[PDB]
Amino acid sequence: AAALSEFTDQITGREGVLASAARLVLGQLGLDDPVN
Amino acid sequence: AAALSEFTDQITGREGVLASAARLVLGQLGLDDPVN
Amino acid sequence: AAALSEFTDQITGREGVLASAARLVLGQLGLDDPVN
């Protein structure tokens, strides 16, 4: 009953979904830098 | 030809879409703090 | 009133969306070859 495949698939699918969506909404991320 | 309505609507709608996607993909954001 | 930007943006965004959907629904495309 190894069911890790479905959780990995959904994690990858929503990751791709957010990556595709956030590219064109001009939502910049990671503008911060470690300055401490 | 005041078309600002459509750009404002799409910005808000895709912002809502990414917010909806964010919560259930356990993607924590803003974990950083200003420590400088 | 140059509005080509919004049509280009939506075309690219939905193209990215369909590409994102394609690669986990195991929908193989282009399996055909020109054999004529």
Mutate which: A7, A12, A17, A25, vs B, most B CBs within 10 A: A25
Pairwise CA distance, residues C22 & C29, whole Å: 9
Pairwise CA distance, residues A24 & B14, whole Å: 10
Q: Determine if residue B7 is left, alpha or beta; phi over 0 gives left, psi from -120 to 50 gives alpha, anything else beta.
A: alpha
User: Which of A22, B22, A26, A5 is CA-nearest to residue C24?
Assistant: A5
User: Which parts of B1-36 fold into alpha helices (H)?
Assistant: 4-24
Experimental method: cryo-EM
Angle at A5 between CA A4 and CA A7, to 5 degrees: 65
| Resolution attained, angstroms | 2.8
| B21 close to A18: Cβ distance less than 8 angstroms | yes
| C24 close to A12: Cβ distance less than 8 angstroms | yes
Question: Which residues does chain B have within 8 Å of residue C3's beta carbon, measured at their own beta carbons?
Answer: 3
